[PDB]
Ligand binder design. Structure first.
Ligand SMILES: C=C1/C(=C\C=C2/CCC[C@]3(C)[C@@H]([C@H](C)CC#C[SiH](C)C)CC[C@@H]23)C[C@@H](O)C[C@@H]1O
Ligand SMILES: C=C1/C(=C\C=C2/CCC[C@]3(C)[C@@H]([C@H](C)CC#C[SiH](C)C)CC[C@@H]23)C[C@@H](O)C[C@@H]1O
Lengths: 10, 240, 240, 10
């Protein structure tokens, strides 16, 4: 869940 | 009667963060699905918003203290506030002369009529444009504009935040900075802080109306399939 | 020694379905995120594939009997076979002279090197291009090309199909049509049917390699965020 | 699940 957000938050 | 050294560090950090994540040349815009003028502008505007969310994430990550929040809180703040920050940061491209957002070339000039061709109604676009001109008339220093984006982002009264006290303390520090900056560095700004706080209230109302209209798009798969994965994630309703 | 009337109805239906869902002008391609020549071509190629999936859905819906399958079976067939149909239908733009897919203008000419800049490797692209030239050398009639796409789509040996007997009966009818068409209407095609069946075997191997490499893209969120919702759905691993 | 596929299949 929120896979892209986690990645962008580093 | 004078800004403290730690206050101006905050301003410097925030200005640099905005400069690194707002490209005044708009040259990346040619990478978006091209604008078309039923929802002919939805592909271009979806890409514009998706691109802008990435920039807002990058700005958030450079706000003092944001990266020290829990991942869940970082997501909670970004999910409720991203659309407001996009509305705030877009004031930099908004023109009082044209009543439009002008991003370099005429292909990337966005009218109210363009946004209706992405699925939104005057119920949102009328208050949004009134918001842009009122904000533009405030004539904010870059220091103030970036402080207001950071204060907006660091609001503890958002659904899903956990560490309320830590976020409110961070936002309190930023508000203190902005009040002191206006008093010391903004000639004739006696009423400015109150006006800027009112704009945060306006953004809540714009946020609500946008989320309502976004739900209509996202519930129709022939429209939601035109969105990006990042827009679906950030504007979606999943909870961490 | 002659095609039956119900056999030529099938051919007519399939030819019309392909003509309605394959636009030889390629004028929609300007609507995609523009090509860029790390994964500079991933946005353009993602949009090309997403657009092509919609066309393959539209073609499937006009295959006799497909719309009478259960929604779950329709999805199962499309999820396992969409990439193969895209590979088959792309032969129409493939050029033996250039060893490339030429879709109108030079901006929409795709080399092997372009596809590597969308995250794929020679392990896929070498057999894919050998497949295209071998298929192009068969010099298929339009009747045959569309029959092979339909036979490919209506394969019962796919993960997740339920009504195996109904789908195999449909595919059997189409194979009978194609065998009869080649025998009666294709001069010198004594070995053609066997070659075309071999190409279906080749597509299975290309499907496997593509899915392997797609899993690498989809597991890296900075790449998967560049895909479209439709690509994520069709190429994804969710099961109905 | 398969929200877009269902829609496109009519
Ligand atoms: C995005 C930005 C810019 C302009 C902002 C605009 C003009 C296009 C329509 C937008 C996006 C509104 C929409 C109602 C929001 C949406 C959606 Si969605 C449901 C298609 C909110 C802000 C509006 C350009 C530049 O200043 C960078 C800045 O970040
Ligand atoms: C798509 C089509 C066309 C060309 C097909 C091509 C060239 C670009 C790369 C593609 C797409 C391959 C990729 C390995 C597939 C992928 C992916 Si996705 C993990 C970036 C499979 C087929 C290849 C043009 C026209 O003939 C319509 C036709 O439908």
């Amino acid at each position: 869940k929120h896979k892209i957000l986690h990645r962008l938050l580093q | 009667h004078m800004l403290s050294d730690e206050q101006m560090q905050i301003i410097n950090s925030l200005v640099e963060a905005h400069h690194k994540t707002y490209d005044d040349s708009y040259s990346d815009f040619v990478r978006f699905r091209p604008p078309v003028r039923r929802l002919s502008m939805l592909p271009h505007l979806a890409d514009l918003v998706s691109y802008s969310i990435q920039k807002v994430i990058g700005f958030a990550k450079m706000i003092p203290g944001f990266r020290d929040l829990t991942a869940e809180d970082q997501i909670a703040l970004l999910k409720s506030s991203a659309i407001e920050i996009i509305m705030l940061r877009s004031n930099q491209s908004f023109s009082l002369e044209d009543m439009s957002w002008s991003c370099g070339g005429p292909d990337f000039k966005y009218c109210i009529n363009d946004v209706t061709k992405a699925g939104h109604t005057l119920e949102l676009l009328e208050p949004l444009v009134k918001f842009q001109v009122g904000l533009k008339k405030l004539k904010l220093h870059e220091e103030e504009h970036v402080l207001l984006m950071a204060i907006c982002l660091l609001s503890p009264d958002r659904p899903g935040v956990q560490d309320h006290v830590r976020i409110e303390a961070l936002q309190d520090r930023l508000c203190d900075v902005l009040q002191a900056y206006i008093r010391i560095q903004h000639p004739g700004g006696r009423l400015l802080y109150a006006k800027m706080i009112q704009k945060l209230a306006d953004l809540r109302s714009l946020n609500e109306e946008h989320s309502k209209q976004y739900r209509s798009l996202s519930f129709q798969p022939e429209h939601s399939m035109q969105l990006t994965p990042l827009v679906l994630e950030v504007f979606g309703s999943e909870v961490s």
